[PDB]
């Protein structure tokens, strides 16, 4: 991956879909790849108290502010729900990177992880120390991300408690994926209706003999098939990570997360869609 590029600008939202091919057991969101770590990469035998308490903290705080600023521009300078979630998602990943529980671990992320092993150490309790460091710093890191907004006004529309609350990375990624899914669904269904809706003759649907429609359904199949694979990978990763801990209340199944993130979420309808057996798809793309 890159380091400087993604500290200058972000790609359009949903420009690159999630990635399930790099690591087979996990789907990575583009935002994660574009996560700014420039300074943290050039971080680094000088394992002084000030090195981790100040130097480290300073470079991360600056990293946070650049990240937050770019997320604001990505959101067209709108200070709304979507901006607050992006800040939350990126804040969480920083957290998992510091705590050494990040699931990406690609390219320069390996470099950073090493830089953190040299600073905190690699002994038994080194893990716990990294946890405390973040816990007693995250509040400041969040503030740095808001610097751009704060530079105009800031602690209000975006709530601190919600963001600083620790949550397994896979939990947050599922929420983010759900938000992206419901943003795409309408568009994809729209493309379909506007080519396949209705019958070509008295008894036969368009999908039976109308090629432009058949090609439309093919495209839909591809989209829904990616979504299908992505959810399967993420939901199983959830169960996998949950089985290996002692836990998060309110959440038992990966669906409970979707229920907490989306309004009027219907798990039965969701499964029907990603499995191409919902009323809409049947009516539009299934001949008989």
């Amino acid at each position: 991956n890159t380091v400087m590029k993604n500290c200058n600008y972000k790609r359009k939202r949903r420009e690159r879909d999630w990635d399930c091919n790099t690591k087979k057991d996990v789907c990575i969101p583009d935002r994660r790849y574009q996560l700014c770590m420039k300074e943290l990469t050039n971080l680094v035998f000088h394992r002084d108290i000030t090195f981790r308490k100040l130097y480290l903290k300073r470079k991360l705080i600056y990293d946070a502010a650049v990240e937050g600023d770019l997320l604001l521009k990505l959101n067209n300078y709108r200070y709304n729900k979507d901006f607050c979630k992006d800040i939350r998602w990126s804040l969480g990943d920083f957290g998992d990177i510091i705590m050494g529980t990040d699931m990406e671990g690609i390219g320069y992320s390996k470099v950073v992880e090493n830089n953190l092993r040299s600073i905190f150490g690699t002994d038994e309790k080194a893990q716990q120390r990294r946890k405390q460091w973040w816990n007693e710093s995250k509040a400041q890191i969040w503030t740095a991300m808001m610097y751009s907004v704060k530079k105009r006004l800031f602690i209000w529309i975006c709530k601190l408690n919600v963001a600083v609350n620790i949550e397994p990375q896979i939990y947050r990624w599922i929420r983010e994926w759900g938000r992206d899914y419901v943003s795409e669904l309408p568009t994809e269904v729209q493309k379909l209706k506007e080519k396949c809706d209705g019958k070509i003759n008295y008894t036969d649907k368009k999908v039976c003999k109308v090629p432009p429609c058949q090609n439309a359904c093919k495209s839909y199949d591809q989209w829904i098939t990616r979504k299908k694979n992505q959810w399967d990978v993420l939901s199983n990763k959830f169960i996998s990570v949950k089985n290996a801990e002692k836990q998060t209340a309110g959440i038992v199944t990966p669906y409970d997360i979707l229920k907490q993130e989306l309004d009027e979420f219907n798990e039965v309808a969701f499964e029907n869609e990603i499995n191409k057996r919902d009323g809409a798809y049947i009516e539009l793309c299934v001949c008989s």
Binding site: I61, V66, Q140, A144, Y147, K150
Partner: peptide, 12 residues
């Protein structure tokens, strides 16, 4: 284009 010092100071 970001004042490194103003960001650091503002974070407190």
């Amino acid at each position: 284009q970001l004042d490194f010092e103003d960001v650091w100071n503002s974070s407190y």
